[PDB]
Design an enzyme around this catalytic site. Structure first.
Site, PDB file in Angstrom:
ATOM      1  N   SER A   1      35.218  45.358  35.759  1.00 17.42           N
ATOM      2  CA  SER A   1      34.370  44.172  35.665  1.00 17.42           C
ATOM      3  C   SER A   1      34.296  43.648  34.235  1.00 17.42           C
ATOM      4  O   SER A   1      34.136  42.442  34.017  1.00 17.42           O
ATOM      5  CB  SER A   1      32.970  44.483  36.190  1.00 17.42           C
ATOM      6  OG  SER A   1      32.019  43.559  35.689  1.00 17.42           O
TER       7      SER A   1
ATOM      8  N   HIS B   1      33.571  44.009  40.389  1.00 23.52           N
ATOM      9  CA  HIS B   1      32.417  44.886  40.523  1.00 23.52           C
ATOM     10  C   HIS B   1      31.130  44.098  40.331  1.00 23.52           C
ATOM     11  O   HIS B   1      31.084  43.140  39.553  1.00 23.52           O
ATOM     12  CB  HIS B   1      32.478  46.042  39.514  1.00 23.52           C
ATOM     13  CG  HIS B   1      31.443  47.100  39.740  1.00 23.52           C
ATOM     14  ND1 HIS B   1      31.072  47.523  40.998  1.00 23.52           N
ATOM     15  CD2 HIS B   1      30.701  47.821  38.866  1.00 23.52           C
ATOM     16  CE1 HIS B   1      30.144  48.459  40.890  1.00 23.52           C
ATOM     17  NE2 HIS B   1      29.902  48.658  39.608  1.00 23.52           N
TER      18      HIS B   1
END
Lengths: 165, 217, 172, 227, 187, 179, 174, 148, 133
Positions: free
Chosen positions: A42, A67
């Site tokens: 992420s 994420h």
């Protein structure tokens, strides 16, 4: 010249650190090339999309991952509502950057942020996070691209060593 | 026996580039704070503005202050430091004749946020996806009597009175308006509505989207 | 806590593990042996537990030849609520201000890469076993049980009757 | 006892065995206060006070206190429950009293507050801790002023002194001897041995403050001029 | 060894001054991190010149796998080696004494404590992989005994029986056992 | 001891409220209602806090009791005992003249997935909304006034608790209450 | 609790099989055969595993008694109770329809010299060959397929455990 | 370099370290200019009082906290009587410094030293710990005299 | 030319004292050993290992003489092998001292039984030093 070559390798990290390195690559006047290797978490997928469109490459061994924002929350009942709404603002923030950069609507991306899911190299070009597949052939072009931009600074380095001697 | 005079940008351009990354930022008059307000990191920022006002020729170039810290309040809510450490920061930064251009990268938790609005008006730079938070500060673990809690209440009384005086000069509000809007509850601010409120003015200079650059091509 | 054993009341308190499940079925072997006509009232209060520990007390209640009664006390988080829904129809009671939470059960996967995929198939088999048995107890479709069991969903006792978790509430 | 404490009890009979030590003493209307006064043992002293209330309404319930302190609200619940019962309570002070156990021995009935010879008593302002935001700091100082105002008028009812003498004593850490606490009104009778009339050094300092003893004539007392 | 020295005109550290003088010092135990600096130092001196390398050992013990990394670099290089003992070499450090310099280049102090024993290992888990690591520890045990039999001239059947238990040698018995070549005198 | 008060139908609620300590009071409350549904049950509350999940089971147990209940507050009542104080029958609510009453919302920690945070965020808000509307019935107070007094983390003397509607009578003739 | 059913020969193998836990099972097993050798002894199984030498101590002690043996499995039996589930005689090995049957090879342990590793290697190689001879007796299965089944971890449903020969009946029928 | 400039910004430490910095500033022949930032604790206010009278500057956000030093240790019965006379003598020793530099009476110093006494920027000038309120001009002359 | 070192040690294993002993005789030139404060068992081996006639000691210095110490745990067989290790190390350091003090070896093992301390006076009589500095 003025090109910036960054390498992308991160399996974790906070979500807020990935947005800072995103806009740190946006306000640069010259272009930027991002090369993803290993994984893209992420914090790393936002750095991958922060480069100039047309110079983003993902290898076959690299795996992009989207994420949700992980956070730590502790406080009273009045304080537990204000920071949980910030998680809705960050989820609105990372879905906005994924929408403006991948030619995708905001509804289909928000149906992907409720569950963690890993992506492959073929799904990276299909969604729009990258542009080309970093195979063995186009990797040779990355070697010759970083050779001319480094010898432009090394030509000045070759003149300083000869002047000192 | 000779004096160790410093060298600046009209003089040290022949001595080569600085080797370490904080020394490139010190030559460019840019202070990047990536650590919360510890007693170790507050001593270097006092010596940094002392060095910038030591032997500067023009003394008029704007000092860029990039802040990314929790201030003195961490994410869990307790006080890792005290609010008196920020009083040494603003008294040392505002001493110099140079204007203070303030910028934020990600976060400013209740001590760096009042320093964000304390810069030069018309040049408050900010990233378009940062978070700003203004909450009243807390105190660390103090074990005392009934009169010991009264004197600790006076320290936080001067904390809200000093923080609202900075916000009244920046946002152009009254003294009691900034206490009711900012220093009452732990709230957060985005980038877009903070421009209407008066925290920031513009974005970072030279900012351009990579998709907006593709639309020009 | 020994006065509840003579009144045919067993206590399901705390997280269910292996020594609690061995003690809970040991009280169920004795209460049906003294009388096979009178019911057994159980006060369920659990925040979760193991996968095989909650399944070890589920099957032995079906072998009791009289019916049983289950009463929710406070909260049942994803393991106690399965014990509520496995009771007799018309005997599932709950407090009016209790809480029912339905979620997939917890469980890890430690071992080799060949080992963690063959043991996650059992967790996928446990998800088909839990949602397959819960769909027959509530009368709903197969899709709506597998749709809400992935995330945590709290249920009020007023809406638990129309969904099929409990049958009635004790207000008095 | 560093490793373990054995059960020191006695139950003996010609036909049946009796109970242990603390169960037998509770049947004789004697309550023991030992250890830290937290919320757990606060229900033990109040619950035993309600147990002996239903047995007899006229016999004197005796409470033995030996504690180095406790929770300020848990020690508050035993005083007002002791003042809201029918029979009189005879308090006996054991060991030491540190700012909370000195309150319950002063909360007894007048004429039944018995303290021993080597008992330590103490009276101070209550302590506390600051917590977080200024909306809770102002709630903390309003809580410490509420605990100080409640405990101020407790000593005014049981001793009959002035409020200026309490503020001068509870300002710092003040330890009182039972010979000094008898003048303050905390207790009613001093417990001595077989003619034990030894003078504690707090009274030798008190005799030096009034001018009865000097360095030349120390008298039949202990030495105090070694400061 | 914390104050530095000099090479010819400038200040250089004491262990690096002997590196230019082709003398290698080993004072700590043989671990994975210090073995990466030793086998990188053997390839650096081999690329510069081709002369005899001196190794002074103070190893009180170590692991088996990084010790074999330093042993195989002695035979791979095209230069000569010579191991000299001062202090003590225990465990796998005593095996590195018999690594090279067999033709009269194994020196020792008269009060050096020598130690020879079979290597060890530890790896648990599945019972099926316990058979594989047992075959690795067996294949490491007899191979370490075959190198000590060829360097010292001892029979192979005596090294299995003696070095399986605890065995310690003084420099008087190290001459007749073929473990060292010469004993260092006072000069 | 504690068994002497049990046969006289008097139970004790002491210490921190846990899940193991919750059902011990509920199991003995239904035994007194089955023995005599006419005789009142006196309880004693001394709690410095507790969980909102196990504390509601004590409130539902007193509502399940057919006989009348009597409450007594001694020591502390912090955020869980003050809710169980007023929850008894009106007119039979007594306490100590110096006991403290704390009306504040319960606490809670949140961690995990992003969808997991917003579930427990509105869950503790629904617990805050349910605890406000229940405590506003027996107090005869408006909802907007009782929802802001629980936000202030300040204790309450029993003198002002009487006209607030939380309590009815004070043991001691209402002259021993100190400010 | 457990003492109210101990007089009717009810054995509960609860918890992890340790040196003290399995010894309490062996010491109560010799009590039941000494009082009456003609009636059956019931043994309940609910355990996530345990030691190799301690878990073997329940099997040979149950074979020491001359009476009949009934075995029931509750929940999960992981390589110690599952080996003890089929340890009883044929015809009286019943199992619950939702109980999980886990087949796994046991573990080992060694710390000392490298010659001490190979002693414990052939010690667990003897224990692996010992249980494969035992498990092939009451299951009527050859040694080729029973060695590979203990290689990987396999959670078995009682529907396929009836034809495998480990259990005999299913309580409830479905 | 006839004047030294030391910025005082610390939370304080032991009282023995604050005595040494105060005695060293009153010993050298050169001038000693002391400027405080933040607060001045028990180890820092002795360096504030250790400067020469006339050039002690504090800002508007500057505070000052004066308190008696802590300490104590575990030992025998008569060992506590020795060090308790030392803490009472150190508390009288720091009272001599505050009475000499600020011209306050000795009985009024120990009343403020009994509790944690905090001071603002206004009452620090009125007490005598500082001289005047600092501003931009009082430190602009500092940075220009040290360049030569 | 001549090495000069300061001897000061209060602890440490005696196995490291044998390493610094043989390193001092490896030098061809003389050695000057000057002990200050405490001299442990590892420090007295370097004090006795110097050249005879140039071992100085102060008035307040002391020398600690004791037997080696070790930690043994494990199987039954290697304890017996390592029991002969600590015995012959104690016999080795007795022969190290015997080359300087010119005393019979059986009297040094009696002093090596327990801890033995010497002041500045009897250090010269026992031959560990030469004169008082």
């Amino acid at each position: 010249s003025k090109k910036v070559f960054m390498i992308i390798n991160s399996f974790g990290g906070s979500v807020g650190n990935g947005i800072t390195v995103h806009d740190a690559l946006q306000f640069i006047k010259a272009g930027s090339l991002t090369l993803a290797l290993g994984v893209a978490a992420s914090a790393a997928s936002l750095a991958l999309a922060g480069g100039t469109i047309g110079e983003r490459y993902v290898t076959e061994g690299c795996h992009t991952m989207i994420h949700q924002p992980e956070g730590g929350l502790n406080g009273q009942a009045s304080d537990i509502w204000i920071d949980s709404q910030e998680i809705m603002k960050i989820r609105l923030d990372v879905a906005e950057i994924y929408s403006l950069s991948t030619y995708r609507p905001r509804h289909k991306i928000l149906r992907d942020l409720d569950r963690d899911f890993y992506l492959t190299a073929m799904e990276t070009i299909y969604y729009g996070l990258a542009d080309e597949i970093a195979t063995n052939e186009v990797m040779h072009s990355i070697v010759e691209m970083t050779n001319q931009v480094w010898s432009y600074h090394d030509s000045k380095q070759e003149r300083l060593l000869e002047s000192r001697a | 026996y000779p004096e160790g005079r410093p060298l600046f940008l009209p003089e040290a351009e022949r001595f080569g580039n600085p080797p370490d990354l904080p020394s490139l930022l010190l030559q460019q008059r840019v202070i990047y704070i990536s650590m919360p307000f510890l007693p170790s990191v507050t001593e270097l920022v006092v010596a940094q503005c002392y060095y910038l006002d030591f032997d500067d020729r023009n003394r008029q170039r704007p000092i860029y202050v990039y802040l990314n810290s929790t201030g003195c309040i961490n994410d869990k809510g307790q006080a890792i430091s005290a609010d008196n450490e920020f009083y040494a920061i603003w008294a040392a930064l505002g001493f110099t004749r140079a204007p203070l251009y303030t910028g934020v990268t990600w976060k400013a938790q209740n001590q760096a946020a009042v320093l964000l609005s304390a810069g030069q008006k018309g040049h408050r730079y900010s990233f378009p996806h940062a978070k700003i938070s203004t909450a009243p500060p807390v105190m660390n673990r103090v074990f005392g009597q009934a009169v010991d809690a009264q004197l600790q209440a006076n320290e936080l009384d001067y904390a809200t009175k000093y923080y609202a005086a900075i916000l009244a000069r920046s946002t152009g509000k009254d003294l009691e308006t900034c206490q009711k809007q900012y220093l009452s509850r732990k709230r957060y601010f985005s980038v877009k509505e903070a421009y209407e409120e008066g925290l920031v003015d513009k974005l970072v200079p030279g900012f351009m989207l990579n998709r907006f650059r593709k639309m020009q091509k | 806590v020994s006065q509840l054993f003579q009144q045919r009341i067993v206590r399901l308190g705390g997280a269910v593990d292996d020594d609690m499940a061995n003690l809970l079925v040991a009280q169920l072997l004795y209460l049906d042996s003294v009388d096979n006509k009178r019911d057994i009232t159980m006060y369920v209060n659990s925040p979760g537990g193991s996968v095989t520990a909650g399944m070890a007390v589920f099957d032995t209640m079906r072998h009791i030849r009289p019916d049983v009664s289950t009463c929710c006390i406070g909260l049942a988080a994803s393991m106690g609520a399965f014990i509520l829904a496995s009771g007799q129809a018309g005997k599932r009671y709950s407090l009016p201000n209790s809480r029912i939470m339905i979620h997939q059960p917890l469980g890890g996967a430690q071992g080799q890469a060949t080992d963690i995929e063959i043991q996650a198939n059992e967790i996928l088999h446990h998800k088909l076993t839990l949602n397959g048995y819960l769909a027959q107890f509530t009368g709903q479709s197969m899709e709506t049980i597998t749709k809400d069991t992935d995330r945590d969903f709290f249920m009020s006792p007023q809406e638990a009757i129309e969904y099929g978790l409990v049958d009635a509430i004790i207000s008095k | 006892s560093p490793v373990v404490t054995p059960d020191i009890q006695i139950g003996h009979g010609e036909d049946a065995i009796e109970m242990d030590l603390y169960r037998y003493l509770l049947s004789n209307r004697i309550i023991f206060i030992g250890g830290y006064i937290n919320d757990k043992m606060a229900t033990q002293i109040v619950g035993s006070l309600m147990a002996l209330e239903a047995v007899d309404e006229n016999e004197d319930i005796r409470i033995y206190i030996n504690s180095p302190g406790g929770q300020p609200y848990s020690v508050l619940g035993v005083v007002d429950a002791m003042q809201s019962i029918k029979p009189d309570v005879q308090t006996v002070a054991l060991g030491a009293c540190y700012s909370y156990a000195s309150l319950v021995v002063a909360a007894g009935t007048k004429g039944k507050r018995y303290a021993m010879k080597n008992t330590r008593l103490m009276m101070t302002q209550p302590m506390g801790g600051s917590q977080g935001d200024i909306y809770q700091i102002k709630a903390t100082v309003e809580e410490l002023n509420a605990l100080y105002q409640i405990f101020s008028r407790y000593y005014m009812k049981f001793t009959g002194m002035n409020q200026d003498q309490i503020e001068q004593a509870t300002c710092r850490d003040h330890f009182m001897t039972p010979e000094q606490a008898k003048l303050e009104g905390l207790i009613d009778e001093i417990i001595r041995g077989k003619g034990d009339y030894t003078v504690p050094p707090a009274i030798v300092r008190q005799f030096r403050e009034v001018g009865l003893v000097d360095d030349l004539t120390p008298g039949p007392f202990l030495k105090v001029d070694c400061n | 060894c914390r104050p530095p020295g000099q090479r010819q005109s400038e200040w250089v550290d004491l262990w690096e001054a002997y590196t230019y003088q082709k003398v290698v010092f080993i004072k700590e135990a043989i671990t994975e991190d210090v073995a990466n600096n030793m086998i990188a130092l053997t390839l650096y001196l081999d690329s510069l010149d081709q002369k005899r390398i001196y190794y002074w050992l103070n190893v009180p013990g170590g692991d088996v796998v990084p010790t074999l990394a330093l042993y195989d670099t002695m035979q791979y290089v095209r230069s000569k080696t010579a191991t000299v003992c001062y202090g003590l070499c225990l465990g796998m450090g005593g095996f590195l004494l018999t690594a090279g310099g067999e033709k009269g280049y194994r020196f020792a102090m008269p009060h050096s404590i020598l130690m020879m024993h079979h290597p060890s290992g530890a790896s648990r888990g599945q019972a099926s992989e316990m058979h594989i690591e047992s075959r690795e520890l067996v294949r490491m045990r007899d191979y370490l005994s075959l190198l000590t039999s060829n360097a010292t001239g001892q029979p192979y059947d005596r090294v299995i029986r003696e070095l399986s238990r605890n065995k310690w040698m003084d420099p008087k018995q190290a001459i007749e056992y073929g473990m060292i070549d010469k004993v260092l005198t006072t000069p | 001891p504690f068994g002497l008060l049990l046969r006289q139908r008097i139970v004790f609620l002491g210490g921190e409220v846990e899940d193991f300590g919750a059902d011990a009071i509920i199991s003995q409350l239904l035994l007194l209602d089955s023995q005599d549904p006419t005789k009142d049950i006196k309880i004693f509350i001394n709690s410095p806090g507790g969980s909102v999940t196990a504390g509601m089971g004590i409130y539902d147990a007193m509502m399940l009791c057919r006989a009348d209940v009597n409450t007594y507050c001694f020591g502390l009542a912090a955020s869980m005992g003050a809710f169980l104080l007023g929850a008894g029958k009106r007119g039979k609510r007594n306490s100590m003249p110096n006991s403290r009453i704390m009306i504040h919302q319960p606490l809670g920690g949140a961690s995990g997935q992003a969808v997991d945070i917003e579930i427990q965020a509105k869950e503790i808000m629904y617990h805050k909304a349910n605890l406000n509307r229940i405590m506003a019935d027996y107090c005869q107070q408006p909802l907007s006034k009782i929802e802001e007094d629980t936000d202030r983390d300040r204790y309450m003397s029993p003198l002002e608790a009487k006209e607030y509607g939380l309590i009815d009578h004070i043991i001691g003739g209402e002259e021993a209450v100190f400010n």
